[PDB]
Design a protein around this ligand. Structure first.
Ligand SMILES: O=C(O)Cc1ccc(O)c(O)c1
Ligand SMILES: O=C(O)Cc1ccc(O)c(O)c1
Ligand SMILES: O=C(O)Cc1ccc(O)c(O)c1
Ligand SMILES: [Cl-]
Ligand SMILES: [Cl-]
Ligand SMILES: [Fe+3]
Ligand SMILES: [Fe+3]
Ligand SMILES: [Fe+3]
Ligand SMILES: [Fe+3]
Lengths: 238, 200, 238, 200, 238, 200, 200
């Protein structure tokens, strides 16, 4: 079983987006009005699932092939790759990275999405991978299109891919969104701008990575993820 | 002062979180192995329990696109981190609210007592993280049990909540569903009866 | 018949790309080595076709509908719109604007394109329009994907749409390429960089135009075109 | 000095120019009306001629993806700008080189004499703009006729070419193709026998 | 035998010197006029010789002792040392580093060098070394003198040492020249200036390294070498 | 975009490259082990061949100070990277042009077939890198064999050379030299018959 | 991106808005023609109705200085933009709350059905803009009618309000006032029963 042997650097909740960010309209009714209650870390918070023995299918990280209905999906072929580290710069190996997205036209394969842009019969929109022993992951996919949404009267999400990362404990678990270098929609988005600090927004922007591209085949973007710093306990209960 | 690399900032899981993390719910085919809401196989040791709940916004309306992750000790008070669908018990699971009724369910065992870092026993609890459209960073809470009143009264975590009234928001209600032991745990994100959320 | 009544401002051939731009490899053997011979403008150069009575089909400017094989094309729905003016700022009405492009994945519907990204059964890639009486044009299409090509070993065109514009004479006729605001491939492209002046490159970058978008439907980009200034003759043969 | 708005800069038409401007050549369906290589219907006045040619690069290899636009006077020396597929004659047309043979063709009439701005007659000519992959800004040239030697010798445009040898590059060669009057006009973009290109 | 399991970052041939650099007069007739033909990496390009078992003499890296004809060579005693890494910062261990140079007076021990400055009877001018397990190499030599040459009427090479580095494949192999910190000849040399980017020139300038000197004995210079980045193949033939 | 450490820039090997890499040629004593032009000992399996050639500049004059490195598969089509003078065969070697005649030579075996990354067989070839005074960055080429014409016709690397005439520049000509099979491979750096050079 | 001239920013109409826009209410003499609360003369076609209402702030107190502008179709479902006091019907009018009772009134006809841009019929509605001291930019709402319940249920605008309970805030209640059909439409700017406000 898991044991309490580490502590995780406290989150900066002015670096993360706050709960109440009214330009993102749905946040108004879905944000607590009472302060969070701070509690000390115990084994409940400092442990978490390890997914080393979850059985992954051959194409779980390959969205060009994991929804194959007789062809390749339409759209910009890309590799999305990066490293997961903690705040001390230590790699996070054997950790679960999950991602999902709309297709090339901004249409999601979800019963609740009625945007008029068509579905792609050979695109599903979900991947998963475990980071390797050095903290690296990679997916192959198509670049998602921007998506309009009923927030303000003419609001459009920049192209984005959702990421979920487990890390070593439930205290490190994170869901975020990746955006793409140069997208002119990024400065305009009320979900991006839920993050108050512009330097934090920069951390979510994947950079074009020509070095990792397959010539005559696919481009590549790099998205590194930083989870809470993990340290040993020291001078506790004495 | 010393400044480390900043943590990657959170963003909302969005209304289509199910595409990635609750495949059946999106209306999509599942893969061979999925992480879902059955923490315990029938022959796991401990008291087998059904958990269920609805999630409310600040206007008292159901949050029908909620996604929940849970982390709990086995019946012996031990966290099992080696996740494997072969295991009779896994400490981790995932669930989501139905789009029609707004109800989530979990199938598990009642967790045993776990000590805090100071060696003080905590009351039986399930750790819950709540994600959804409109939630920019997930909300942490704990589900405790109404039939553990003595332990609850002594829990060093519960006792960090300054007002007694607010502690009641974390106590799930024992009931019966088709002759089987169940607890209801509703979450109110905002307003009257607002559920306690934690930072750690 | 047409008559010689105007003169066109001389081209700045250091503003346009030069002929020999060796990083764009095919330019090496396809650029003249002798100087161009300057000639005075005559009726041969200062007149040109007017296409007012060319018969346009209903969907000639609408690439979402002009290759309909049972559905909509996949990819980012956009309007591409702008004004054609001359260097004096005068609008160029009733002029022919033609455009063509690859699909959302960078694949062209041309027998000679063998890039492995699939064709889209509902996308053709060609539009045409006449500017209105105030010089404005507009197309509806899908944003083209980047395209690898055999120049250097890992060269990729930024997303681009080809434009051809007739203007009032054969002296004003132009073919160019439109690029998209923020595309990180633009600074890296040897075809873009055939243009030596960075301010000239900026003239080919279409700007995101939220004002012209259809909410819940399609985004919009603005691309204004400037043709050679046209003036009356003065003090000639005296 | 006075600086106007800068002209939009040119770029190569690229290897797939046919998608947009020569639909059949790309291997695609045509629209109802297309601007193509038949300037004259059978009953247009003037001498009906076939024009044909190949385009060579600096290594003497065929440019198989050339696209050409042409502008010429009718047989009476008048430019007809009102383009209409109903017309018996149009002054404007388009052609392209075949991918296998590298040959372009045009069906037209021999243009009549047109005066320059100073009132001096120019020899019969067709204005040509050449576009292709590898050509960053289109190349302007003129096609004159070898059976107009007297007029050619006096052309104020031809006479602006400083070297007599280079004037010969703009003179098309009269031949016969299936008993019909034709002229060949090859273009050499670079090197030995390089075709004169104009700026105006 | 060797295997095709790696790819090498594509060279930036605007960072390297171009072929045609007319101020370096011999480049005019010895530069191709046709474009290079890009080819994809195969096992022919991504493999190369490993010299782990080449037999080195005891003084192969020591030019003060490797041409001993009764005495020490005349001139500035120096160690030249550094690290060979790739563009990802990964050390390149067990790789062949070869170097050659003129003597203290700028005279080369080569039958074709007729410069009037004398040969040194105890200096040959050639060294070779294999990098250690951490990518480091070291030579002991005399600082070479500047050398006049028949380019322009008064051209002089800065002091320089030629280096050849094999690296992991024939795609990484490189010959370059090391120059010395502060040498006022460096900005005037048409061979240096074959490199267009002044930041690239800086990469060839060895820095005085007092930390590595032997007091009362020899100074030291540091010259680090960066070869093309090496990565594993990903998502090929699928 | 992601920018890595820049590669160390190339410089010319200079006219005295021999001092460092071709010791004998410089006029100098050799060390006990040298990397040179005999890739195969008599005992090596495969067809033993002599390669020879001259190098020309853009004025058609011999490049008398050329230095060449070669890399080739063994007769099985396998690259042998473990360089050792004890080996019957090494995949790597070096040669240089004579200052007098300007001819280089190599003693080797004909390489076997190697597939490209896509599994398509390449015709037998020797990879060559050429260095000299006046060459700022070495030039890459391949030597193919004229007695492999049918294989050469299908080579996916030769077929990337757009013009068939340029492919001929890479085909060495078989001859007999003192009763042994030889091939001549001359390189023209610039101008008429310019040798194809690669980037990869 | 393309940036247009910025719009002139809004400011509150202030507590003395009546001076400019409701002259009588201010305590002041009126001009010969005023824009006011009688949209329909007795002769106008359609069903003549009285509308009335009160406006409440977040503490449940009357907003006694409210100013309202209304815009509605005629009985045929056509908007009449040609404003003229001679007209039997005008699509536009103005009203204000009494400082004493806080009630506004309007005299009009029930509007006919209007389709949205997609051709789907909207239930009969009055567009309202609300201005007052404390309101920095006017609030947009719609008044629908409780005797149109079946049409309201299918209105594509009401159906954009995600929560059914919030749609009820836009439904005016039919009553009789001095023998004439009337509807009460109260507006709650903030808090319990907060009226839906639109952006467009
Ligand atoms: O609420 C909606 O209209 C749908 C919506 C909005 C924004 C997103 O990023 C998304 O995935 C879905
Ligand atoms: O030559 C090729 O490989 C094809 C190619 C390259 C660049 C382009 O912009 C294009 O449309 C086509
Ligand atoms: O020009 C020549 O041939 C002589 C020369 C010039 C420059 C050098 O660096 C060198 O080593 C030799
Ligand atoms: Cl590391
Ligand atoms: Cl205007
Ligand atoms: Fe989204
Ligand atoms: Fe293109
Ligand atoms: Fe030198
Ligand atoms: Fe005031």
């Amino acid at each position: 079983p898991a044991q309490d042997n580490s502590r995780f650097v406290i989150r900066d909740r002015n670096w993360h987006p706050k709960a109440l960010t009214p330009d993102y309209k749905t946040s108004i009714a879905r944000s607590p009005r009472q302060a969070l209650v701070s509690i000390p870390q115990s084994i409940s918070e400092t442990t978490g699932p390890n997914f080393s023995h979850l059985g992954f299918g051959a194409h779980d990280h390959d969205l060009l092939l994991n929804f194959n209905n007789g062809g390749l999906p339409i759209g910009e072929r890309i590799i999305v790759a990066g490293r997961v580290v903690d705040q001390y710069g230590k790699p996070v190996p054997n950790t679960l990275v999950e991602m999902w997205q709309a297709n090339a036209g901004g249409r999601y394969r979800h019963k609740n999405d009625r945007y008029l842009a068509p579905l792609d019969p050979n695109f599903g929109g979900v991947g998963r991978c475990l980071t390797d022993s050095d903290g690296y992951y990679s997916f192959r996919t198509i670049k998602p299109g921007p998506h309009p949404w009923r927030n303000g009267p003419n609001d459009w999400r920049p192209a984005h891919i959702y990421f979920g990362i487990s890390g070593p404990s439930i205290a490190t678990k994170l869901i975020t969104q990746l955006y793409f270098e140069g997208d002119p929609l990024i400065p305009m988005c009320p979900i991006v701008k839920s993050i108050a600090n512009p330097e934090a927004v920069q951390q979510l922007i994947a950079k074009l990575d020509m070095n990792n591209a397959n010539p005559m085949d696919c481009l590549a973007y790099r998205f590194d993820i930083v989870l809470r710093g993990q340290r040993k306990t020291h001078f506790e209960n004495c | 002062p010393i400044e480390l690399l900043p943590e990657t900032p959170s963003q909302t899981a969005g209304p289509y979180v199910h595409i990635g993390l609750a495949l059946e719910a999106a209306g999509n085919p599942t893969r061979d192995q999925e992480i879902w809401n059955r923490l315990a196989k029938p022959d796991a040791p401990g008291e087998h329990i059904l958990l269920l709940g609805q999630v409310y916004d600040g206007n008292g309306h159901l949050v029908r696109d909620s996604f929940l992750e849970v982390w709990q000790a086995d019946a012996n008070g031990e966290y099992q981190d080696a996740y494997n669908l072969e295991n009779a018990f896994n400490s981790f699971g995932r669930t989501a609210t139905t789009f029609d009724a707004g109800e989530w369910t979990l199938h598990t065992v009642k967790p045993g007592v776990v000590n805090n870092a100071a060696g003080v026993p905590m009351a039986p609890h399930i750790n819950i993280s709540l994600f959804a459209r409109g939630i920019n960073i997930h909300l942490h809470t704990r589900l405790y049990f109404d039939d553990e009143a003595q332990a609850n009264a002594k829990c060093p975590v519960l006792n960090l909540i300054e007002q007694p009234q607010r502690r009641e928001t974390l106590i799930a209600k024992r009931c019966e569903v088709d002759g089987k032991t169940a607890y209801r745990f509703d979450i109110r994100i905002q307003g009257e009866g607002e559920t306690v959320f934690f930072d750690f």
